Amino acid sequence: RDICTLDNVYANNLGMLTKLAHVTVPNLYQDAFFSALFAEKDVHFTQMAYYSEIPVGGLVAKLVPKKQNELSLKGIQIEFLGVLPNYRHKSIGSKLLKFAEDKCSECHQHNVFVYLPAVDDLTKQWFIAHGFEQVGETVNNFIKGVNGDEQDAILLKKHIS
Amino acid sequence: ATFSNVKPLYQRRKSKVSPLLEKIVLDYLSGLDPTQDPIPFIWTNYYLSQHFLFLKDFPKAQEYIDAALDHTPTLVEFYILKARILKHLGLMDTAAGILEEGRQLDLQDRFINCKTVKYFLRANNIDKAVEVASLFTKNDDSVNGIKDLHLVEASWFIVEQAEAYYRLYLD
Amino acid sequence: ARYGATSTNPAKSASARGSYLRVSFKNTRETAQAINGWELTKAQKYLEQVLDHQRAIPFRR
RNA sequence: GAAAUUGUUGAAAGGGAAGGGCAUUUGAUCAGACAUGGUGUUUUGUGCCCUCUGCUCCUUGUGGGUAGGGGAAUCUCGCAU
């Protein structure tokens, strides 16, 4: 089969997922945010991308069915997108985005929005090269760190056919 | 098990075979790539760390295992090797902490749990070792799983715990 | 059948019956009021001293 | 399947009666009260809000029942709010 495989993140290996947030984008997430994912009311989609039977990519998104008290962004919210720097240039992020778009289309949705930092240009250009559109400019005080650091954020949206 | 594949040979050969093997491994690693071939890169790093740990080397082995963890931190064997190196260097508590942190990544394997319990028993930590072991055991008429461990006919656990008791009594 | 007014857990409360007994109401009620409030291991030993004439059973009403 | 009647739990009482009238402390118990009816403004989810309007039946005057979309910053015409 293909060297890049997909798997559903379970609970026993959930502790591995929390490790990804510590080897991708530090100072952004906590521990309760990952502990309350499988704690037995929003729909959460988890995906683990293996490269030659090795966990290399992680995707955690949340579905928002609300539309009454919201402007225009009902769809899959790409929250955690962890890809190691050593595992790039192999269409791994492309496969993750394709799986996200497939899960968005299977949930009767036609909009995918993602939040990105304002002090990062390489990741911004990488996400724009796929086919995203910037929503306005930046957001004043949106990203909250671990110690208490705050910065601006940008929104990238895409319409799914 | 690559090092295992050369484990008995190292018990019979040394200054004649190990230098050639090290040279071949270095020549193979010098032509690899951390991005194009990540799997061969991490396996070569693990083999080099094993070979240097067998040759009574510790700083270079720690450097290699740290580079391997920074390259791919999703392998239990790396944490096991780090715990073994820290145990050989006299750091039992740090090894137990690292191995527990690595075991918390995936809670489905029993070999890693037994290794963690053994390393905690070797680290003068009995209560935490029992609390960790009391998970996959059958809990019925007891607050922990000591009765279950005694009913499954154990031996190594009792031996490792009695040694910790003797060390704590001698201290 | 059933019983009376209970105020405990019926899941861990054993009981018997044995109806049709030609004894005496004034004696059965009195010995039931006297044995009430004591433990089982003490009630089993207190009844052995009644036949030996040591601790009699007084009357109230 | 009710009553005089004894049995347990729970509450009251007591210096030769209890029981009761006018009223009440205390314990137990209990419905009603519109603390949910409306005026008019700020709010969003939104519908018969603009709309592609379809399929099906009585007959004017402005035609009745059945359903999948595009924008929800027009509108309070509607329910929560």
From Swiss-Prot, chain A:
Q: Does the keyword Ribonucleoprotein apply?
A: no
EC primary class: transferase
EC id: 2.3.1.258
Which keywords does UniProt give here?
Acyltransferase, Cytoplasm, Transferase
A GO molecular function term, named singly, is: protein-N-terminal amino-acid acetyltransferase activity
The listed locations are: Cytoplasm
Look up the record and give one Gene Ontology term from the biological process aspect. mitotic sister chromatid cohesion
Provide the catalytic activity annotation.
N-terminal L-methionyl-L-alanyl-[protein] + acetyl-CoA = N-terminal N(alpha)-acetyl-L-methionyl-L-alanyl-[protein] + CoA + H(+); N-terminal L-methionyl-L-seryl-[protein] + acetyl-CoA = N-terminal N(alpha)-acetyl-L-methionyl-L-seryl-[protein] + CoA + H(+); N-terminal L-methionyl-L-valyl-[protein] + acetyl-CoA = N-terminal N(alpha)-acetyl-L-methionyl-L-valyl-[protein] + CoA + H(+); N-terminal L-methionyl-L-threonyl-[protein] + acetyl-CoA = N-terminal N(alpha)-acetyl-L-methionyl-L-threonyl-[protein] + CoA + H(+)
The protein's matches in InterPro entries, at most eight in alphabetical order, are given as: Acyl_CoA_acyltransferase, GNAT_dom, N-term/lysine_N-AcTrnsfr
CDD domains attached here? NAT_SF
GO cellular component annotations of the record = NatA complex
Is Cytoplasm one of the keywords UniProt gives this record?
Answer: yes
An example Pfam family from this entry, by short name, is Acetyltransf_1
All copies of the N-acetyltransferase domain together span 12-161
Q: What does this protein do?
A: N-alpha-acetyltransferase that acetylates the N-terminus of proteins that retain their initiating methionine. Has a broad substrate specificity: able to acetylate the initiator methionine of most peptides. Non-essential component of the NatA N-terminal acetyltransferase.
Q: What else is known?
A: Present with 2370 molecules/cell in log phase SD medium.
Family to which the UniProt record says this protein belongs: Belongs to the acetyltransferase family.
Q: How does it assemble?
A: Component of the N-terminal acetyltransferase A (NatA) complex, which is composed of ARD1, NAT1 and NAT5.
**Name this polypeptide is given:** N-alpha-acetyltransferase NAT5
- This chain is encoded by the gene named NAT5
UniProtKB/Swiss-Prot annotation, chain B:
Q: What is its main location?
A: cytoplasm
Q: What domain of life does the UniProt record list for this protein's source?
A: Eukaryota
Q: Give the disulfide map.
A: none
The record's keywords, sorted A to Z, are: Acetylation, Coiled coil, Cytoplasm, Phosphoprotein, Repeat, TPR repeat
Compartment(s) of residence: Cytoplasm
Q: Which GO terms describe its molecular function?
A: acetyltransferase activator activity; ribosome binding
Task: From the UniProt record, list the TPR repeat ranges.
Answer: 42-75, 110-143
- Provide the record's note on post-translational modification: The N-terminus is blocked.
Q: Gene Ontology terms, cellular component aspect?
A: cytoplasm; mitochondrion; NatA complex
Q: How does it assemble?
A: Component of the N-terminal acetyltransferase A (NatA) complex, which is composed of ARD1, NAT1 and NAT5. Can self-associate. NAT1 associates with the nascent polypeptide chain and the ribosome.
| Additional free-text comment from the UniProt record | Present with 7600 molecules/cell in log phase SD medium.
Record's function text: Non-catalytic component of the NatA N-terminal acetyltransferase, which catalyzes acetylation of proteins beginning with Met-Ser, Met-Gly and Met-Ala. N-acetylation plays a role in normal eukaryotic translation and processing, protect against proteolytic degradation and protein turnover. NAT1 anchors ARD1 and NAT5 to the ribosome and may present the N termini of nascent polypeptides for acetylation.
Name the record gives this protein: N-terminal acetyltransferase A complex subunit NAT1
From Swiss-Prot, chain C:
**Sites of the Glycyl lysine isopeptide (Lys-Gly) (interchain with G-Cter in ubiquitin) crosslink:** 45
Its domain of life reads Eukaryota
Entry similarity comment: Belongs to the universal ribosomal protein uL22 family.
Q: How does it assemble?
A: Component of the large ribosomal subunit (LSU). Mature yeast ribosomes consist of a small (40S) and a large (60S) subunit. The 40S small subunit contains 1 molecule of ribosomal RNA (18S rRNA) and 33 different proteins (encoded by 57 genes). The large 60S subunit contains 3 rRNA molecules (25S, 5.8S and 5S rRNA) and 46 different proteins (encoded by 81 genes). uL22 is associated with the polypeptide exit tunnel.
Q: What job does the chain carry out?
A: Component of the ribosome, a large ribonucleoprotein complex responsible for the synthesis of proteins in the cell. The small ribosomal subunit (SSU) binds messenger RNAs (mRNAs) and translates the encoded message by selecting cognate aminoacyl-transfer RNA (tRNA) molecules. The large subunit (LSU) contains the ribosomal catalytic site termed the peptidyl transferase center (PTC), which catalyzes the formation of peptide bonds, thereby polymerizing the amino acids delivered by tRNAs into a polypeptide chain.
Other remarks in the entry? There are 2 genes for uL22 in yeast.
Name used for this protein in its record: Large ribosomal subunit protein uL22A
The gene name reads: RPL17A
Span within the full-length protein is 2 to 62 of 184
